[PDB]
Every structure is written in C-alpha cells, then in structure tokens.
Amino acid sequence: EVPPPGEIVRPPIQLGETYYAVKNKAIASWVSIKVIEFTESTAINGNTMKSYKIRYLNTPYQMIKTVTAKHIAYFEPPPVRLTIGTRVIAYFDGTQSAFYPGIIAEPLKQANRYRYLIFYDDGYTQYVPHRDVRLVCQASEKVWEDVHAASRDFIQKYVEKYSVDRPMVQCTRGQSMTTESNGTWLYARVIDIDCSLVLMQFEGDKNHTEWIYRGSLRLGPVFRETQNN
C-alpha cells in the first residue's frame, strides 16, 4: 500500500546482516552484501570515522571491499513514506534491471498516483512505487554532496533553492521543443506525458526517446522562461 508519514529512521548497520552496496562505480548498480567486519577510527580531535568490510553475496569467488555507510542501503523498503531530498537507491527495470542511487524528487501523492519521482545520480529520471526504494544508511546534511559530480549542481539547485513555483513546461502531445541531448540542442516532439515527466522523441531517430523532467533546462522553453526570470 501507501506507507504512512512518520520518522525516517537509520538504524546502525549490524554484523552478519544483508544490505545493498556499490558493486564497483558509485553511480552504477547496488547489489546484495553481508557486513562481515566493522572498523571504527578515532583521532585526537574527536571524530569517530566508521568503515565496513562487505562480502558480496551470490558471487563466483570471494569478493570483499571496504566502504562507508554512504555506500550501503537497507535491504527492506522503509516503513514510512519518504520526502524530497531523501537519498535512496531505487529499482530501475526499464521495460539491465537493478538498484541505482538517487534522490526523492517528489513525495507519494494523488497527483502522481503515489509514486516517487526519482532523479538518479546518472541523470536518468523515473516514477517508482514505494516498494522499489531503499534508504541509504547515511547521508550528508547537504544531500547533493553525496551525488555523483555529474548531477551535483542540478540536485543542489533543485533541493537547496527548491520552489514549488519553479518553471515547469506546459505541453500537449505533438508539440515540438528544442531539447538538449549529450551536449547537442536537437529538435524533439512530445510523445507522452506522465505527471512531471514528458516523453520526448528527437527528430534524428524515432527509437531515440527519453523521459525528461518538465522543469529541466534541457527543454528550450524552460531554459527560455528561466533566463527571463
């Protein structure tokens, strides 16, 4: 169902328990692990810095790594609904299917059919149900500081300078807009709409379609509306 609001708790990581953690690259897939060793280091100043030795589960041979709590996520979905700015891993299926890091961009609500809007670290965006998210075991007070350097500045403006009155493009299927794709500003047509997302098809290829955030500066009209202030 829709979990109720409440306290978003981060219990301490336990020895022998199952979690998710960064497989290799931090912005890539997070997979099943067992916490096999706990490391704690304390300096003359006071800061007690925690580390965790993890064993990757379901592997061809023993694979061990040392990571921080910022690179580990709980195995079960939270018992409460999550809010904007919450650091998560969200399950991407894509019609490779796996857990990738992101930020809750929208909470669960009627207006979005009780789905979280995810802004993945790699720049991808999708609507995911509550059951497909896991809370990251630790986060910075400034959550964009935990986000891959690629989407960092976008997350910072979105979260830190958050406004419900931010420019959002109003569109209908069949309209065309100038749309940015990997450095190039191309011609794109609205194919589908899903609440805060718009499905754009770039003029070059009909198989080149992408779900874009309607408030993204990758859409020319949004960029135009933002320049005029």
Partner: peptide
C-alpha cells in the same frame, strides 16, 4: 542511456 538533468 541519458542526456542528464541539465544542459
């Protein structure tokens, strides 16, 4: 594949 969230 993704073009990001910003230009």
């Amino acid at each position: 594949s993704t073009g990001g969230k910003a230009p």
